[PDB]
């Protein structure tokens, strides 16, 4: 139920709580594992643009420690593109949650970032909330039929879902079990140049508070 | 007047149909993999990786919130990849074979550019051929146009592979997975 007409006043900000999609993964490398995220870039400023939407650009960076993982809200910079700072959960307000690019590292000819990789993710939706504010592209006219009276203002249709997690069993773990590198996938079949290795994990089934 | 609302369920990482090889050894038709006309048509549908990141652009900024100071977009991004491996195969062209391909298609046999084909071997009827340049009883003059393809009305994602072949497999992901299957 979302009744017509609209009830509230000037500001109607809320306090809520959610969780994330469970994600286990594991990597092995001699070069550090790269990754990407969606971030802003420059536009074409000679065309008289009807809307002046911020263009988007892919950025293959290198993963640091302490950078967050995808939380179901996509792999973007929330630092500069969420100007209101108040639509994602607290921890992801001022950073960028990167995500790996498997199909790039595999296509590198020397193959010195993947010896072995595994992943498991699952996610569904629990509730449904709509955002507030004025739509950038309001809906064009020939897909609906107007009304009169309490149907005066079109409701702002910025819908966003909430991630929900799932059950987490112990049959579907990924740790405390060994892994023998019988054959790597690239060309570097286990050789660690420069006398260093880079393992990385992101685990979020063991994250109690 | 009832209608329900479908939702769908959890999306695992083991119920996927992508990021995997698929070898073929027997197609379900009599076409065992051959692509006449030197094109394919690959089509995929996914609804599992269908997130909707949302933007936020401001109007005027100060540390006391008003909901009209911001104006938001909704955007959505999807990418893909394709990889292939092909195999050279020859057709011996003798007398009893070009009669078979002729009944399937005309456009195949002309596109090897080795000859032309009279479409009948003649017909029986007179077909009432006029010569007097059209001033007596009107007929349908039917000017032809081959139009060079039938699919040009439609719109696809055209990708090109004219400059992306190779002869050495093992410098690519698919070659290193394919060669471990065959043992070569």
């Amino acid at each position, epitope marked *: 139920s979302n009744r017509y007409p609209a009830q509230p006043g000037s500001d109607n900000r809320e306090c809520l709580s959610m969780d994330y999609k469970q994600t286990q993964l594991c990597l092995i490398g001699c070069k550090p594992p790269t990754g990407e995220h969606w971030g802003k870039g420059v536009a074409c400023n000679n065309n*008289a643009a009807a809307t002046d939407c911020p263009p988007l650009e892919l950025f293959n960076s290198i993963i640091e420690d302490g950078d967050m993982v995808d939380t179901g809200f996509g792999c973007m910079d929330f630092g500069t593109l969420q100007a209101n700072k108040s639509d994602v959960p607290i921890d992801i307000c001022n950073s960028t949650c990167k995500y790996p690019d498997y199909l790039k590292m595999a296509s590198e000819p020397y193959g010195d970032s993947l010896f072995f990789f595994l992943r498991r993710e699952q996610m569904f939706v629990r509730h449904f909330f709509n955002r507030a504010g004025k739509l950038g592209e309001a809906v064009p006219d020939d897909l609906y039929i107007k009304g009169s009276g309490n149907t005066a203002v*079109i409701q702002s249709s910025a819908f966003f879902p909430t991630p929900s997690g799932s059950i987490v069993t112990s049959e579907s773990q990924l740790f405390n079990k060994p892994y023998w590198l019988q054959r790597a996938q690239g060309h570097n079949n286990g050789i660690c140049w420069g006398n260093q290795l880079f393992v990385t994990v992101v685990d979020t089934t063991r994250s109690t508070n | 007047a009832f209608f329900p609302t479908p939702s769908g369920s959890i999306v695992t990482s083991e119920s996927q149909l992508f990021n995997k090889p698929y070898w073929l050894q027997r197609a379900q038709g009599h076409n065992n993999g051959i692509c006449w006309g030197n094109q394919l048509f690959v089509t995929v549908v996914d609804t599992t990786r269908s997130t909707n990141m949302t933007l936020c652009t401001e109007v005027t900024k100060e540390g006391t919130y008003k909901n009209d100071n911001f104006k938001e977009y909704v955007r959505h991004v999807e990418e893909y990849d394709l990889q292939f491996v092909f195999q050279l195969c020859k057709i011996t062209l003798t007398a009893e074979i070009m009669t078979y391909i002729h009944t399937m298609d005309s456009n195949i046999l002309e596109d090897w550019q080795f000859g032309l084909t009279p479409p009948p071997s003649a017909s029986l009827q007179d077909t009432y051929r006029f010569v007097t340049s059209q001033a007596i009883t009107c007929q349908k003059t039917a000017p032809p146009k081959e139009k060079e393809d039938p699919l040009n009305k439609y719109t696809f994602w055209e990708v090109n592979l004219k400059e992306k072949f190779s002869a050495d497999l093992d410098q690519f992901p698919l070659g290193r997975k394919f060669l471990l299957q065959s043992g070569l």
Partner: antibody
Amino acid sequence: QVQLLQSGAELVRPGSSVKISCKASGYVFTSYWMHWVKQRPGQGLEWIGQIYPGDGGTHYNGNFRDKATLTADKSSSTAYMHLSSLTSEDSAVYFCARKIYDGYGFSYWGQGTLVTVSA
Amino acid sequence: DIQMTQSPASLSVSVGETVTITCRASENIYSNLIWYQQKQGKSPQLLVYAATNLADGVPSRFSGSGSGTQYSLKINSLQSEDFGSYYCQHFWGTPLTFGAGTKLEIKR
């Protein structure tokens, strides 16, 4: 190409109501807030309000409260202001305001509209 | 409202001098100022946005400065295309206020 047309001169009577309008093109009209302004002759500009064509959410100035009725129309791509019971101290020039989609300041203006009250 | 105190009322200047218009408000607005140019019989035109950043088409004689409650714009080697009437505009607040207006006049 973006443009804001405006009628330049407008002669009226004091105590009556006048319908001032400006025309919008070159962009999509429902994606921008619109503002109107008043430069008192021998004074700086005065900002009067803030209006959106998409929903119709209005905003006025308290010193213009009940003085102007901000309403628009989306079919002919124009916005209106309509001063009620006009007096002599609002004999001035007027523009309607267009910012960038970001919206710090007003990038394009109209032409101007000077109003005079007499018998 | 936060009212703006633009000074001077005018200035007589010739070509080449370094000029400065005072622009002062009541509250700490955080560099959200716009300066403008009006000639006679004409409409205003965008010069600088957010008190440091120029919008397109303009020469580099204009340079913005200041933080806190005070801001001023600097033009070196002022030219004949710059003569007109000016306005410095802050843009936080219900309601938005503007500059007092200086008519940039010629020296003789």
